[PDB]
Structure formats: structure tokens, C-alpha cells
Amino acid sequence: SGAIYVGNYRVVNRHLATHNDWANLVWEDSSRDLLVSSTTAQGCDTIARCDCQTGVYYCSSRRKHYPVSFSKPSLIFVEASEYYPARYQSHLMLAVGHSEPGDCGGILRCQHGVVGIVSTGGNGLVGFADVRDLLWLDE
Numbered sequence: 001s002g003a004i005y006v007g008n009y010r011v012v013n014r015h016l017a018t019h020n021d022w023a024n025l026v027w028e029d030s031s032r033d034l035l036v037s038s039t040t041a042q043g044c045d046t047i048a049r050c051d052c053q054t055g056v057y058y059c060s061s062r063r064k065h066y067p068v069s070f071s072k073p074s075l076i077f078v079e080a081s082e083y084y085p086a087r088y089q090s091h092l093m094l095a096v097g098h099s100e101p102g103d104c105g106g107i108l109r110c111q112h113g114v115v116g117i118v119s120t121g122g123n124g125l126v127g128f129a130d131v132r133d134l135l136w137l138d139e
């Protein structure tokens with residue numbers, strides 16, 4: 001679980017969006033596993049605008065923040081789960097790190113701010129949904 005709170009926006013994994021989220025929708029993309037809903041109060045997260053490939057992510061299944069190197073946002077095969085059929089997920093970055101289902105929503109941050117949120121994983125892999133291209137989150 002977890003979200004990004006920037007301006008009057010709440011950014012969550014689309015597969016974990018609550019009933020309150022769909023009733024206040026701004027934008028969603030199934031192929032990216034992202035959903036953005038509107039908020040009444042202003043949030044304080046800053047979105048990174050960079051091409052960093054090193055950062056720190058929060059892993060709820062270990063209660064630890066880990067430093068990682070991560071790939072550039074790409075179209076990557078994601079196996080079928082209870083939330084999506086087998087498909088390519090776009091704008092996804094992989095790192096070598098622990099993750100389990102339950103860790104989705106953990107923030108990945110670099111020196112410039114929020115880069116993305118945990119969205120997928122594997123044996124010793126963790127995947128993050130990038131948000132650095134969503135320039136409109138700033139305005």
C-alpha cells in the first residue's frame with residue numbers, strides 16, 4: 001500500500017485504487033498500473049524531473065528503505081496476476097531488490113524527489129511505475 005500526494009492529486013497503483021478514488025478520478029492508465037484522483041487538501045511531495053538511475057525505495061515487507069540502481073522506463077512483460085492478465089506494462093523500471101505483493105505503493109526517491117512507486121516484482125527483483133514524465137502533476 002502507499003500513495004504520492006502532490007498538489008491536489010493522489011497517485012496510487014491502479015490495481016489498489018479504493019472506491020473513494022474512482023469516485024474522484026483525474027487520469028488512469030491500465031498499461032502503466034497508475035491512477036490519479038483529486039484531493040481536497042494540498043500535498044507536499046515533489047516529483048523528480050531527471051534521468052537518475054540510482055535512488056532509495058521503501059520496502060514495507062522488510063520495514064526498510066533500500067538504496068538501488070534501476071533501469072530506464074520501459075515496456076516490460078508482467079506475468080498474469082489476480083489484477084491483470086499477462087501483458088506488457090509500460091513506463092516500468094526494474095531493480096535488484098526484495099519485494100512481495102503488499103509492497104506496491106512504496107515510494108522510490110532520488111536527490112530530485114519522487115521518481116515512482118513499487119508496482120511489480122520477481123525473485124530478487126522489484127519494479128517501479130515511473131511518474132517523472134507526468135509533467136502535468138506540477139501544475
Ligand SMILES: CSc1ccccc1N(C)C(=O)N1CCC[C@H](C(N)=O)C1
Pocket residue numbers: 015033078081083084089099100101102103104118119120121122123
Ligand atoms: C510487488 S508485486 C510482486 C512482488 C514479488 C513477486 C510477485 C509480485 N507480483 C505478483 C506482481 O508483480 N504483481 C501483482 C500486483 C500487480 C502487478 C502489476 N503491476 O501487474 C503484478
Ligand SMILES: [Zn+2]
Pocket residue numbers: 048049050051052110111112113
Ligand atoms: Zn533524480
